[PDB]
Amino acid sequence: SGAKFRISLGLPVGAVINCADNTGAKNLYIISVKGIKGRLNRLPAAGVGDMVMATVKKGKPELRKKVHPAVVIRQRKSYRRKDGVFLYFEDNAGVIVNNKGEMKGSAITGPVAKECADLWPRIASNAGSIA
Amino acid sequence: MKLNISFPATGCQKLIEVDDERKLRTFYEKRMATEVAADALGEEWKGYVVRISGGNDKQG
């Protein structure tokens, strides 16, 4: 019901982030974000909770050379929650997620922020600790 | 939030429930097993000083 508030985005096109799930993929190179119109000379950027499109740059052989939709899990750009805290994470992170929301993985390493765990309810169930 | 009150001087007990917090910050931000005065609780609670002795969380 309640939609997702605006948080500061700090992952433009061309960022490799940690593929933190149990597929075997270890990188996610962001190729484009889903939902971005953008203006002239504007990199489509993503933040926490923004389901994105990525390519695995390092990992298993059968997960590379192919575009996977993904979902950003952690960023280290300090985004602002509405209750007044500037949270940020240690590293950037993401899991591999099909178009319906369900993960290709089965487990998620480390924390998932609440801004993604509320928006993607099946990433939240595989999450060890939230925010 | 339920409160299991107990009289150890003869050894009986029963359970009450209250659902407002300006009656309940007399308990909050303490340790376990400190002495708090229950005189800020209500109409029948005058002269009663009490031990909070710990209890179960929302998940038990």
Partner: protein, 100 residues
């Protein structure tokens, strides 16, 4: 509002201020300001830095019904030794019957 405490220094973080850090292993660390944040990410012990709180606590600067129970309880000991005497009236006569 929850008025939390800074992880490096240990002052009292108010709701608008501060900054929140979350590592890859849980461990959500609060910070009052970037003076504390830089000194935490540089991995500095607070116990060696003179302005915090964990320094100053280290260096110690600053500062049968009850009626019957009570009825037998309050009983006077000459009545008790007389009761001991009719216990003797049982026992020594019974032991004369033991040998007899």
């Amino acid at each position: 509002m929850k008025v939390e405490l800074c992880s490096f220094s240990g002052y009292k973080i108010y709701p608008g201020h501060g900054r929140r850090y979350a590592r890859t292993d849980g461990k959500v660390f609060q910070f009052l300001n970037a003076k504390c944040e830089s000194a935490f990410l540089s991995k500095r012990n607070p116990r060696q830095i003179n302005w915090t709180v964990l320094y100053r606590r280290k260096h110690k600067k600053g500062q049968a019904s009850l009626a019957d129970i009570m009825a037998k309880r309050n009983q006077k000991p000459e009545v008790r030794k007389a009761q001991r005497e009719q216990a003797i009236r049982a026992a020594k006569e019974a032991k004369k019957a033991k040998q007899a």
